[PDB]
Amino acid sequence: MRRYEVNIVLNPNLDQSQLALEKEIIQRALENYGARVEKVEELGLRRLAYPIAKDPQGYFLWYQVEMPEDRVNDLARELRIRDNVRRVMVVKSQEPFLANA
Amino acid sequence: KRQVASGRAYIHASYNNTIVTITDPDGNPITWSSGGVIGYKGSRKGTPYAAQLAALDAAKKAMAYGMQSVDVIVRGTGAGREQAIRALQASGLQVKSIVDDTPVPHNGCRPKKKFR
Amino acid sequence: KAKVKATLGEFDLRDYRNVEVLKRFLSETGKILPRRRTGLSAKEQRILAKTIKRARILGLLPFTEKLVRK
Amino acid sequence: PITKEEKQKVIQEFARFPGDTGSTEVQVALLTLRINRLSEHLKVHKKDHHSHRGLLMMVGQRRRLLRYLQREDPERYRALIEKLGIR
RNA sequence: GUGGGAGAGGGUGGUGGAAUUCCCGGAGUAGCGGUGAAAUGCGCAGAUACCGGGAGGAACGCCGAUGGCGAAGGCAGCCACCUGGUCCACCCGUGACGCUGAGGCGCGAAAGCGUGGGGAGCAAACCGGAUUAGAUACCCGGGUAGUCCACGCCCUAAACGAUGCGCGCUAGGUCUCUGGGUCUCCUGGGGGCCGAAGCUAACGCGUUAAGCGCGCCGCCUGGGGAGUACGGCCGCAAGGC
Ligand SMILES: [Mg+2]
Ligand SMILES: [Mg+2]
Ligand SMILES: [Mg+2]
Ligand SMILES: [Mg+2]
Ligand SMILES: [Mg+2]
Ligand SMILES: [Mg+2]
Ligand SMILES: [Mg+2]
Ligand SMILES: [Mg+2]
Ligand SMILES: [Mg+2]
Ligand SMILES: [Mg+2]
Ligand SMILES: [Mg+2]
Ligand SMILES: [Mg+2]
Ligand SMILES: [Mg+2]
Ligand SMILES: [Mg+2]
Ligand SMILES: [Mg+2]
Ligand SMILES: [Mg+2]
Ligand SMILES: [Mg+2]
Ligand SMILES: [Mg+2]
Ligand SMILES: [Mg+2]
Ligand SMILES: [Mg+2]
Ligand SMILES: [Mg+2]
Ligand SMILES: [Mg+2]
Ligand SMILES: [Mg+2]
Ligand SMILES: [Mg+2]
Ligand SMILES: [Mg+2]
Ligand SMILES: [Mg+2]
Ligand SMILES: [Mg+2]
Ligand SMILES: [Mg+2]
Ligand SMILES: [Mg+2]
Ligand SMILES: [Mg+2]
Ligand SMILES: [Mg+2]
Ligand SMILES: [Mg+2]
Ligand SMILES: [Mg+2]
Ligand SMILES: [Mg+2]
Ligand SMILES: [Mg+2]
Ligand SMILES: [Mg+2]
Ligand SMILES: [Mg+2]
């Protein structure tokens, strides 16, 4: 098992009924794919650098996991299914390279 | 018949011609002009004298609908691309801002033999 | 002219999420500044490029912009 | 790929003695395992040609050592080949 | 072996924005385009230029380099899986297990071929317009095979460092990529520039040798005729050795 980082951006127009549903669906997919979550950072409403889905903003999610490596692209395919889910980028974790130290 | 009094102006400058469009803040055009709109026919269209006169013909057409404040958008390199702007400041239209939005691709399409 | 690394702090070169610092390494347009303007090294600029492109896909850094001059 | 956990499992099984990391038996064991990791990677991905080159060099290096084992002590050669199922 | 390291190395899937073309709509008149000047072409069935929306294919701007990787061909968006090569620190293990390499086998840009797709841009042939003494061309408008993908052939090149591979020896200076180090520097392994000795017909090469040596493979012996004829092997063909 290697360590990854999940970046999910979804439609920033949801109420709490649809937001909790989208996120507990995200939690449901991580259970089926075996991603032990280590920590979470939620930014949410953030000003985008260009229009995405005609919408000037996005709601940002970040998860840090440790999961089996073979099931990565299957997981990426499982998250783009939801209409509200717009951007899915998964990156293998890396060391914090410092500059001007 | 519109009474816009504010909007944008697009300058499409090429080596063979320079053409001006005048629009409202939404992007929809009101009037326009070019090197062929005025009497010039041949290669005289891509000359700075043409670009100047083409600008000022559209500028007076915009006075009909009442334009006063104008934003400028420029696309393309070519003779008279600057003569059109210099004509536009002294056209009576108070020029608000001047933006260069010339489209550059990320090397997606293969150019004709001319451009290689 | 000053250079970016000269006027900055101790930062993470691999963090694609910090836009406030990655904004300083973009020009007026969305273009990546050359090494002569960032004051970085060979290994540093190669990482900066890859982390800037990441922030672009996340809608954080722009691909291109509009120059207001001329 | 091939983690250090699976690596130690091979060395300790084919070591002539404790602490032996570089015997001819150990190298051919290590080589053969990378052979099988690649032969299954080349069953699929038949168009991965550059990886097919590294495989040809390992087979050469694997047969390089067996031709040496043959000449010095043929018994441990047969005990090695019978243990790995080669040739 | 162990522990670290850099990379357009390869393959598979996925994915992002710019841009071209085309469709839809909004808005808007009289031309656009293109050249040394022009004309065929397109435009009132409403184009060009502008805004919004949609679709499709191909190629990756800046980073970007005199840079990196690979045995050569060659390899640039980003993400992930699979994966090859190589380099440095330790002085741990095996104990000459090495180098080259006629055959054989595998790889091999582009172009061309087969079957089935795909088809935006570009574009042989060709359809036009010009130029001209003439235009079977350079310049201009259109445009099919093809370029792209999958699977199977084809085996050529200025396939270039016009320098085969490996090793040892033979002043340095400087620029650089990447490791390690007691981190003005020292020490490796690549990639450039000057230059000692020396070689070379000269230009030039010079610790990345074209120097000094050693091992092994390839190949040369005047030009045209001619990479032709004949024969053979290969290939569906074009044609290759
Ligand atoms: Mg979606
Ligand atoms: Mg003209
Ligand atoms: Mg790669
Ligand atoms: Mg690849
Ligand atoms: Mg229309
Ligand atoms: Mg007509
Ligand atoms: Mg008509
Ligand atoms: Mg008609
Ligand atoms: Mg189509
Ligand atoms: Mg460049
Ligand atoms: Mg190399
Ligand atoms: Mg590797
Ligand atoms: Mg020892
Ligand atoms: Mg001993
Ligand atoms: Mg060899
Ligand atoms: Mg041979
Ligand atoms: Mg070939
Ligand atoms: Mg081809
Ligand atoms: Mg074909
Ligand atoms: Mg064309
Ligand atoms: Mg043509
Ligand atoms: Mg004629
Ligand atoms: Mg020689
Ligand atoms: Mg150091
Ligand atoms: Mg060196
Ligand atoms: Mg001398
Ligand atoms: Mg000589
Ligand atoms: Mg020299
Ligand atoms: Mg030498
Ligand atoms: Mg011969
Ligand atoms: Mg003779
Ligand atoms: Mg003769
Ligand atoms: Mg021939
Ligand atoms: Mg004969
Ligand atoms: Mg024959
Ligand atoms: Mg035959
Ligand atoms: Mg021929």
GROMACS .gro file of C-alpha atoms in nm, chain B residues 2-112:
model
  111
  103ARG     CA    1  -3.010   5.165  -2.908
  104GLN     CA    2  -2.850   5.430  -2.680
  105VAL     CA    3  -2.562   5.217  -2.552
  106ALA     CA    4  -2.311   5.493  -2.467
  107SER     CA    5  -2.061   5.231  -2.347
  108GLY     CA    6  -1.907   4.912  -2.478
  109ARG     CA    7  -1.610   4.741  -2.638
  110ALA     CA    8  -1.420   4.774  -2.966
  111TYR     CA    9  -1.240   4.486  -3.139
  112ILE     CA   10  -0.948   4.557  -3.374
  113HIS     CA   11  -0.866   4.260  -3.600
  114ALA     CA   12  -0.534   4.353  -3.762
  115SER     CA   13  -0.384   4.136  -4.036
  116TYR     CA   14  -0.115   4.194  -4.296
  117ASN     CA   15  -0.380   4.214  -4.570
  118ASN     CA   16  -0.650   4.411  -4.384
  119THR     CA   17  -0.741   4.578  -4.056
  120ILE     CA   18  -1.106   4.569  -3.946
  121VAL     CA   19  -1.292   4.732  -3.656
  122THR     CA   20  -1.607   4.616  -3.476
  123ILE     CA   21  -1.793   4.820  -3.214
  124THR     CA   22  -2.010   4.642  -2.958
  125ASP     CA   23  -2.190   4.683  -2.625
  126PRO     CA   24  -2.057   4.556  -2.288
  127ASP     CA   25  -2.211   4.212  -2.358
  128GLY     CA   26  -2.016   4.141  -2.679
  129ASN     CA   27  -2.301   4.194  -2.925
  130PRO     CA   28  -2.194   4.433  -3.205
  131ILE     CA   29  -2.357   4.764  -3.298
  132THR     CA   30  -2.175   4.882  -3.613
  133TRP     CA   31  -1.844   4.817  -3.783
  134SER     CA   32  -1.606   4.915  -4.062
  135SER     CA   33  -1.300   4.788  -4.246
  136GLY     CA   34  -1.053   4.867  -4.522
  137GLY     CA   35  -1.301   4.755  -4.785
  138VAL     CA   36  -1.589   4.950  -4.632
  139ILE     CA   37  -1.407   5.270  -4.725
  140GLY     CA   38  -1.308   5.310  -5.090
  141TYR     CA   39  -0.981   5.114  -5.073
  142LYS     CA   40  -0.994   4.785  -5.265
  143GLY     CA   41  -0.661   4.607  -5.310
  144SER     CA   42  -0.353   4.579  -5.090
  145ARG     CA   43  -0.432   4.938  -4.987
  146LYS     CA   44  -0.658   4.783  -4.720
  147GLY     CA   45  -0.370   4.665  -4.502
  148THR     CA   46  -0.217   5.011  -4.483
  149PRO     CA   47  -0.210   5.237  -4.174
  150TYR     CA   48  -0.405   5.507  -4.358
  151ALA     CA   49  -0.678   5.248  -4.417
  152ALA     CA   50  -0.668   5.127  -4.056
  153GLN     CA   51  -0.704   5.486  -3.935
  154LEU     CA   52  -0.996   5.571  -4.165
  155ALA     CA   53  -1.167   5.238  -4.093
  156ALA     CA   54  -1.150   5.310  -3.720
  157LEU     CA   55  -1.289   5.662  -3.757
  158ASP     CA   56  -1.575   5.549  -3.981
  159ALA     CA   57  -1.691   5.304  -3.715
  160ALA     CA   58  -1.631   5.564  -3.443
  161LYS     CA   59  -1.871   5.809  -3.608
  162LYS     CA   60  -2.123   5.529  -3.661
  163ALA     CA   61  -2.106   5.464  -3.286
  164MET     CA   62  -2.184   5.832  -3.226
  165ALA     CA   63  -2.524   5.766  -3.386
  166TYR     CA   64  -2.611   5.515  -3.113
  167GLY     CA   65  -2.443   5.753  -2.869
  168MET     CA   66  -2.121   5.578  -2.765
  169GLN     CA   67  -1.896   5.780  -2.535
  170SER     CA   68  -1.691   5.537  -2.324
  171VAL     CA   69  -1.512   5.263  -2.518
  172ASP     CA   70  -1.295   4.966  -2.424
  173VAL     CA   71  -1.046   4.840  -2.684
  174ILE     CA   72  -0.962   4.479  -2.774
  175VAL     CA   73  -0.684   4.410  -3.027
  176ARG     CA   74  -0.613   4.083  -3.210
  177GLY     CA   75  -0.338   4.025  -3.463
  178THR     CA   76  -0.015   4.184  -3.580
  179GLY     CA   77  -0.010   4.391  -3.895
  180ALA     CA   78   0.046   4.733  -4.043
  181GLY     CA   79  -0.188   4.991  -3.894
  182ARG     CA   80  -0.260   4.790  -3.580
  183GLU     CA   81  -0.123   5.088  -3.384
  184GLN     CA   82  -0.260   5.350  -3.624
  185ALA     CA   83  -0.608   5.218  -3.546
  186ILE     CA   84  -0.558   5.265  -3.171
  187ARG     CA   85  -0.400   5.609  -3.211
  188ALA     CA   86  -0.701   5.699  -3.426
  189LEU     CA   87  -0.934   5.563  -3.157
  190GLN     CA   88  -0.812   5.783  -2.871
  191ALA     CA   89  -0.859   6.107  -3.068
  192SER     CA   90  -1.186   5.985  -3.224
  193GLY     CA   91  -1.376   6.159  -2.943
  194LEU     CA   92  -1.451   5.824  -2.781
  195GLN     CA   93  -1.293   5.827  -2.436
  196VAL     CA   94  -1.083   5.510  -2.444
  197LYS     CA   95  -1.122   5.319  -2.118
  198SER     CA   96  -0.868   5.035  -2.143
  199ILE     CA   97  -0.668   4.862  -2.416
  200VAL     CA   98  -0.625   4.484  -2.404
  201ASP     CA   99  -0.432   4.260  -2.644
  202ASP     CA  100  -0.617   3.927  -2.676
  203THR     CA  101  -0.443   3.789  -2.985
  204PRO     CA  102  -0.513   3.412  -2.988
  205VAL     CA  103  -0.206   3.191  -2.967
  206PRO     CA  104  -0.252   2.811  -2.984
  207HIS     CA  105  -0.062   2.552  -2.783
  208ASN     CA  106   0.067   2.403  -3.112
  209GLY     CA  107  -0.251   2.212  -3.194
  210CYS     CA  108  -0.305   2.256  -3.568
  211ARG     CA  109  -0.052   2.217  -3.847
  212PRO     CA  110   0.000   2.550  -4.030
  213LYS     CA  111  -0.001   2.593  -4.403
   0.00000   0.00000   0.00000
